[PDB]
Design a protein around this ligand. Structure first.
Ligand SMILES: O=C(O)/C=C/c1ccc(O)cc1
Length: 360
């Protein structure tokens, strides 16, 4: 059934432990295109609170009630897996805003805005090698996101000559990691890698410093916003953190494809929300619309919004529209690469005097 508007269902996490990721994603929607190819965009923006059940419910609603042309979300990995499962069963294009283990069952209908974990691990393990780190301890979520990172540390990390000497896990809502941190200190690794996101990533950060761990601490791209620094305080000093280029458009070459989109997003965002309010997360939902600005006019050549033919045409256009310039990288998807990113999609940050600083 044909419609004038293009319908985009968005489920993000604006309450609960991961609200630090979902709020900037929702807030960045004020600055995306409101019309593509003559057609107005109608967004239905829902909270899932990070819960995979809620995300399933929202994604099913997008299919059976909203009849969405495209689904986007969620903000953290477990509900993103749930969304991807629903979108693939229902045959609806899905743009993930959190990392997703992309299996054959999820690969046809899902693409992924966040940088794949091995691209981010590479830059962290290289820094470790360059700084005489041999032994490494890990603390991460007891879920698929914590697994993705531990698995990369084990495969890519060990291959580069690192030795993992401790593995601890914690749950997203935990308010204490006392026992886990005590085992990490006893192990005394050269460095610790934290596999977490948002404000929760600051919990092992502060706890390690409080218990007298003085070694280097590495954080993932899940931690890349002001919230981490606000909660970690002094304990964030000297942290090494993987991040997308949206954290430093000013530092990029004038000719870099990521520069104009990053300046555009950050200029508008930080004017509303103050200096250094840029985030990894606002980059993803802004970039999801950069992708739609490219694929929708192509799909409009074969079909109209609100039809299964339009959804299928979007899916094909994601395969043929190459080098999509965005704040976080330059995207080119294939049948088997649903992330579509390269080295232009990552930089390395540290923290000095409560500010993010590029490590060159
Ligand atoms: O907590 C998680 O499952 C991961 C969150 C995440 C979100 C955006 C990123 O770019 C990286 C990690």
């Amino acid at each position: 059934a044909e419609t004038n508007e293009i319908t985009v269902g968005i489920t993000v996490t604006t309450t609960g432990p991961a609200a630090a990721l979902g709020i900037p994603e929702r807030n960045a929607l004020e600055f995306v295109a409101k019309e593509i190819g003559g057609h107005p965009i109608k967004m239905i923006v829902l909270d899932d609170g990070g819960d995979p059940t809620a995300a399933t419910t929202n994604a099913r609603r997008f299919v059976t009630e909203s009849k969405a042309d495209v689904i986007m979300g969620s903000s953290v990995t477990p509900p993103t897996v749930a969304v991807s499962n629903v979108a693939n069963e229902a045959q609806v294009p899905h743009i993930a805003l959190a990392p997703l283990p992309v299996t054959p069952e999820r690969a046809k209908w899902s693409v992924v805005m966040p940088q794949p974990i091995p691209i981010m691990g590479k830059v962290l393990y290289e820094h470790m090698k360059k700084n005489n780190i041999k032994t490494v301890g890990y603390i991460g979520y007891s879920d698929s996101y914590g697994d993705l990172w531990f698995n990369d540390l084990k495969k890519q990390g060990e291959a580069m000559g690192l030795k993992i000497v401790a593995e601890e896990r914690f749950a997203r809502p935990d308010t204490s990691v006392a026992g886990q941190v005590l085992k990490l200190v006893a192990a005394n690794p050269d460095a610790i890698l934290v596999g977490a996101s948002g404000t929760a990533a600051a919990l092992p950060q502060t706890a390690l410093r409080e218990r007298g761990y003085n070694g280097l601490i590495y954080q993932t791209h899940g931690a890349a916003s002001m919230d981490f620094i606000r909660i970690a305080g002094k304990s964030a000093e000297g942290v090494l953190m993987a991040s997308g280029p949206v954290m430093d458009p000013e530092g990029q070459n004038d000719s870099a494809l990521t520069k104009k989109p990053g300046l555009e997003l950050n200029t508008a965002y930080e004017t509303k929300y103050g200096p250094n309010s840029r985030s990894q997360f606002a980059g993803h939902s802004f970039d999801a619309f950069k992708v739609l600005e490219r694929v929708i006019p192509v799909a409009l050549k074969t079909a109209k919004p609100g039809t299964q033919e339009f959804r299928e045409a979007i899916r094909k256009a994601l395969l043929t529209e190459k080098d999509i310039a965005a704040s976080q990288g330059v995207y080119s998807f294939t049948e088997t690469d649903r992330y579509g990113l390269d080295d232009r999609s990552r930089i390395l940050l540290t923290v000095k005097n409560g500010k993010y600083v590029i490590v060159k």
